[PDB]
Amino acid sequence: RMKXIEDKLEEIXSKXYHXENXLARIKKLLX
Amino acid sequence: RMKXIEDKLEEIXSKXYHXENXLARIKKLLX
Amino acid sequence: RMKXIEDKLEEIXSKXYHXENXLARIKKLLX
Amino acid sequence: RMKXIEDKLEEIXSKXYHXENXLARIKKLLX
């Protein structure tokens, strides 16, 4: 319940890596 | 409480699909 | 505790509006 | 449990700063 929430939060804290490195893809398409 | 949280987390884990496929829209505007 | 979490989740479900409409800013900079 | 969740939520509410200011990087690459 709480651990299997905190361990969705640590998927989101993956999505906010893959957010960053999407954007840094785009920024290095634009230098 | 916990399930109707985990089931917001599984909306966010939709938003982080629609994040990805927004960016992959942009990347394929830029190839 | 649970309500003042669910009501952070409904800030994030604002950020994922302002995600979308950031990107749709960018897409309509690119048409 | 609940506080060490709410205090992941306040990391995500950092990621959704660094989301915004990524995009505003990109927008000011595009003016």
Side-chain angles (χ1 to χ4, degrees), chain A residues 2 4-5 8-9 11-26 29-31, chain B residues 2 4-5 8-9 11-26 29-31, chain C residues 2 4-5 8-9 11-26 29-31, chain D residues 2 4-5 8-9 11-26 29-31:
Chain A
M2 205 98 315
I5 296 171
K8 299 300 176 182
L9 295 161
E11 302 190 56
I12 291 155
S14 187
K15 300 294 181 188
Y17 194 89
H18 287 91
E20 303 157 16
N21 283 280
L23 303 178
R25 118 9 145 233
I26 297 164
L29 297 160
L30 296 178
Chain B
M2 205 98 315
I5 296 171
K8 299 300 176 182
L9 295 161
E11 302 190 56
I12 291 155
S14 187
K15 300 294 181 188
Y17 194 89
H18 287 91
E20 303 157 16
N21 283 280
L23 303 178
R25 118 9 145 233
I26 297 164
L29 297 160
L30 296 178
Chain C
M2 205 98 315
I5 296 171
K8 299 300 176 182
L9 295 161
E11 302 190 56
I12 291 155
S14 187
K15 300 294 181 188
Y17 194 89
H18 287 91
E20 303 157 16
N21 283 280
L23 303 178
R25 118 9 145 233
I26 297 164
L29 297 160
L30 296 178
Chain D
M2 205 98 315
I5 296 171
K8 299 300 176 182
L9 295 161
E11 302 190 56
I12 291 155
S14 187
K15 300 294 181 188
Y17 194 89
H18 287 91
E20 303 157 16
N21 283 280
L23 303 178
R25 118 9 145 233
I26 297 164
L29 297 160
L30 296 178

